Amino acid sequence: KFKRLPRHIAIIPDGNRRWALARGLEKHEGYSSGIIPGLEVYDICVKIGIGEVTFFGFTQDNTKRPQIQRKAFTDACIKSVQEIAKRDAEILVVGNTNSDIFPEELLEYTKRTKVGKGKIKINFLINYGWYWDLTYAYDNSPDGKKMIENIASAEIPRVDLLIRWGGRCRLSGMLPVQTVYSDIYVVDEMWPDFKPEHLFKALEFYQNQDITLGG
Amino acid sequence: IPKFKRLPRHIAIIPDGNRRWALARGLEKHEGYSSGIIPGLEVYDICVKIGIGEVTFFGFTQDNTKRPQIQRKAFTDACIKSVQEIAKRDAEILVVGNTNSDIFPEELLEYTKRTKVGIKINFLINYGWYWDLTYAYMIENIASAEIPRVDLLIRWGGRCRLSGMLPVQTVYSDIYVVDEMWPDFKPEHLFKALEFYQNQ
Ligand SMILES: CCCCCCCCCCCCCCCC(=O)O
């Protein structure tokens, strides 16, 4: 139980192909084991009263990978959205829907959708690209102020805390406008090895930040 | 100096921790910035020595100018001295920031187009991420368009965040946090960051 909680947590559920290779599995076979961890993060966030969580699903650049991996991460993303849809969330999917790569299955979540009891915002980046996001604005806006509040991800507010699994300390183009001031916590374990303590340590790190220091 | 297997093309530096450094030494909060000038030179010297192509220094942002006036003068004066000390060396200097302000130092106006064209050192001075992206009014028209993708961003003072540095160029950057405050810069801080980078 925390004095200070982030309003909005970003999750980069990385390490799936490494986890699978380490386990004696094929690379493409780790993604199926990323679905459960997502559901557990959702569970703990609801439980402590986190307002909003954004999951990084897959990028436009991720779809340049072997088809056996694209099929596998895409299916795992589809199923995570469908499963949170079975819970008590306000669900939103953001991504380039003007592409055959965007899964039909997720179109119905491209406007925020209340399921069960609601009262937690869950976002998924699906066929997302930072360049697509920033320039969604540049195309046919009156000015700079309008351009920025009309990025593709404009419905997603500033990220307070970004937690990335798989031990890499990088944003991989997740929400460059919303992450300018995000505190970044790296978990060395791969996403399918998610444990609650990963999120609890990320929340202790956020609480432990010195609020006198400014942006 | 270690022999490096691979090096980044472009290092970003966030020289943070100056105020905590001064407080820990019983000095005034604003009295740590001037102890950040020589560390800048040490980084420059190591980067030329090992042949890094480009370094961008976070100097100060528009958000930083909300700080007390006594802090603002100390960090602005230290940024001006750091640009001047690098300008004496064999470096192509570029300053990026909002010059349409009383805050922008007239001394640095001559670096707002890259000098000695033909190591590249960039400084962000009265820089703002919102100001940068809105400058066009795309990749090539933002205020910082001359500054390419950052490969490795190294931040002193223990905080793991960009504080609005170059949102476009940092999207894929590998980030290395030194817990020590910037005035406590040691050569091994930069070497451990390069060992991190080559291990990715
Ligand atoms: C610019 C090269 C070195 C300059 C010497 C240090 C004095 C100016 C640097 C101020 C750094 C401010 C970084 C603050 C980051 C943040 O906003 O959290």
Numbering used by the authors:
A (entry chain A): 5 to 219
B (entry chain B): 3 to 120, 124 to 142, 151 to 213
Give the article text.
MM_0014 from the methanogenic archaeon Methanosarcina mazei is known as a versatile cis-prenyltransferase that accepts both isopentenyl pyrophosphate and dimethylallyl pyrophosphate as acceptor substrates. Cis-prenyltransferase (cPT) generally catalyzes the consecutive head-to-tail condensation of isoprene units and produces (Z,E-mixed)-polyprenyl pyrophosphates. MA1831 and MM_0014, which are orthologous cPTs from the methanogenic archaea Methanosarcina acetivorans and Methanosarcina mazei, respectively, unusually accept both IPP and DMAPP as prenyl acceptor substrates. The overall structure of MM_0014 is in a ζ-fold, which is similar to those of so far reported cPTs.
After cleavage of the tag sequence, which should have given the N-terminal sequence starting from GPGYQMDIPKFK where the methionine residue is the putative first residue of native MM_0014, the enzyme was further purified using gel-filtration chromatography and then crystallized in its substrate-free form. In each subunit, a β-sheet was composed of parallel β7-β6-β1-β2-β5-β3 strands, and there was an antiparallel β4 strand that existed only in subunit A. The β-sheet was sandwiched by α-helices, and a narrow cavity was formed by α1, α2, α3, and α4 helices and β1, β2, and β5 strands. An inorganic phosphate, which might have been bound throughout the purification process, existed at the opening of the cavity of each subunit. Moreover, a long electron density patch was observed only in the cavity of subunit B. Because the density was thought to be derived from a fatty acid bound to the recombinant enzyme during the expression in the host E. coli cells, palmitic acid was placed provisionally as the ligand because it fit the density well. Although the C-terminus of subunit B was disordered, the C-terminal structure was resolved in subunit A. The C-terminus of subunit A extended toward the cavity of subunit B and covered its cavity opening, where the carboxyl group of the terminal Gly219 residue interacted with a carboxyl oxygen of the purported palmitic acid ligand. In contrast, the cavity of subunit A was in an open conformation because the C-terminus of subunit B was deemed operationally disordered.
